Design a protein around this ligand. Structure first.
Ligand SMILES: [Co+2]
Ligand SMILES: [Co+2]
Ligand SMILES: [Fe+3]
Ligand SMILES: [Fe+3]
Lengths: 314, 314
């Protein structure tokens, strides 16, 4: 019994089953929600997330990994409410989601102070609860590896060395931050097989994607349906190409869907053009039927959505 | 009764009395307190706040203006507990305190949606209470007038137009950021006499200070006791030189004291050499006696601590 579950007992990795490795029940800015509660609706958010999870379960999904952490509104109590309503296996995480600078709390604070916050969440529990974190989540985007972004990466390595949970990342697919996160994490002694470099499905540069996978880490083909980053047809033929070239040992697939997100870019006005078919079940409606009538047999699908998450968490 | 107060009925500006224009009951990072509650202690914070305010009332302070807003952990229920335990007149505000970028919630959101939040706090109330904001707080520091900093400035100008509350600023004394804020706000139509340009007391360069005051705005000599910005001795010389030259009608004086502050810079082991005598009552022991034994009579003292707060809030 290694992997902690929100609102359930920890399970052994052989029981994870068909997993969606990267999906968000709810996303918000902590400071904004605290200071202006009138902009949010708890009841509409709960019922949206319940409705999305149940439909993914009708397609056979057993476990959702939810990498919502500090900076994006991680609420451990909301999550265990959604678990009770649906019965999904739900893995929560710890970490810090920043692109530039840490919050003011962290001025004059060591990398060890930050890693201790991740270890508290893993070993004791999240937000005063006994639900424990099952991975660490870190991020870098267009601003590159800044000094505080580097501090967070090095803090994740300390927490993994001490607890053995794996690491999921957010990177920008067109600026090498994915390769850099992998380089810093492995220089500091993390097993590359415990790193999922994220948002690599945002590019059709097969060479860049393959260079990360050849250094031993999982590649996140994890934003199916966010057309503004890359359209579905283009992601599909990249997934096909990687599978034909033999890379199914490192492929993980998901949607990065947010059953609610408070960001202004994700208004319903903009949905028709930026992300029309985006949801937690799009891969069942499109990608997997696309792969199979393109010669990919069901043993490969099992590897990607079951065997690979099992190894990540083993 | 144009000034609203926390936990009390509003008062006419002529009844504000002896005022400390810039002090903080509590400062923390919204995301950190939300994600790691084990780092904070609500009972100790409450007690530290009650004791400092009681001490300021001992010396005759009637009114405290607390410019804690989003980004610095404003909590109106906490402020109203302190009020009921002490009897102080406490003015809370609205605003956004950032140095670089806004939280992700604001991406693809206009200046008008930002002004709308300030106005909600002024006209309807704060955090779901009927305590209303009496001014708008904005900040800029070392990174200068960035894109998102400029947005918040203009948003504060629009809230001023609709509601007439004044504007307090945080600036860096060696950046010209204080001069930029005054230029931008006055270009969008704000009465220069409703603007307090903050943290000018951190410098001894009197030509820059007189520059902002000459163009009609109050000047904040508001960090008495934070020696790392400037020792008390130099602050007294600058304050006297300004009064001796007729700028008493523009001077406001305070400490920027934080009864509790969570940033690592302010941890207690740093206090002996960063801010030894920092408190809400340092000016009663040092600064006010200094001024009186150098030719400043009680009418000028009353101008700075009673007449100027009154005119600012009129
Ligand atoms: Co991401
Ligand atoms: Co300030
Ligand atoms: Fe995500
Ligand atoms: Fe302040």
């Amino acid at each position: 019994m290694r992997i902690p579950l929100v609102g359930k007992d920890s399970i052994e990795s052989k029981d994870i089953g068909f997993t969606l490795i990267h999906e968000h029940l709810r996303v918000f800015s902590e400071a904004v929600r605290q200071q202006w509660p009138h902009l949010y609706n708890e009841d509409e958010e709960f019922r949206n997330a319940v409705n999305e999870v149940k439909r993914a379960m009708q397609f056979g999904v057993k476990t959702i990994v939810d990498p919502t952490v500090m900076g994006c509104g991680r609420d451990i109590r909301f999550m265990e409410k959604v678990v009770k309503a649906t019965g999904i296996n739900l893995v929560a995480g710890t970490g810090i989601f920043i692109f530039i600078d840490l919050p003011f709390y962290f001025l004059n604070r060591s990398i060890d102070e930050i890693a201790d916050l991740f270890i508290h969440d893993i070993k004791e529990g999240i937000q005063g609860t006994l639900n424990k974190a099952g991975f660490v989540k870190i991020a870098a985007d267009e601003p590159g590896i800044t000094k505080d972004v580097e501090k967070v990466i090095r803090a994740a390595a300390i927490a993994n060395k001490e607890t053995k949970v794996p690491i999921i990342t957010h990177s920008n697919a067109h600026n090498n931050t994915g390769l850099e996160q992998q380089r810093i994490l492995t220089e500091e002694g993390v097993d590359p097989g415990k790193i999922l470099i994220g948002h690599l499905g945002d590019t059709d540069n097969i060479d860049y994607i393959k260079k990360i996978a050849d250094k031993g880490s999982f590649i996140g083909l994890d934003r199916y349906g966010l057309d503004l980053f890359l359209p579905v047809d283009k992601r599909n033929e990249t997934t096909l190409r990687l599978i034909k070239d033999g890379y199914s040992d490192k492929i993980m697939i998901s949607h990065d869907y947010c059953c609610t997100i408070d960001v202004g870019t994700a208004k319903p006005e903009y949905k028709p053009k930026l992300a029309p078919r985006w949801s937690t079940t799009l891969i069942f409606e499109d990608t997997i039927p696309f792969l199979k009538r393109n010669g990919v047999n069901e043993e490969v699908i099992a590897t990607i959505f079951k065997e690979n998450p099992k190894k990540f968490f083993s």
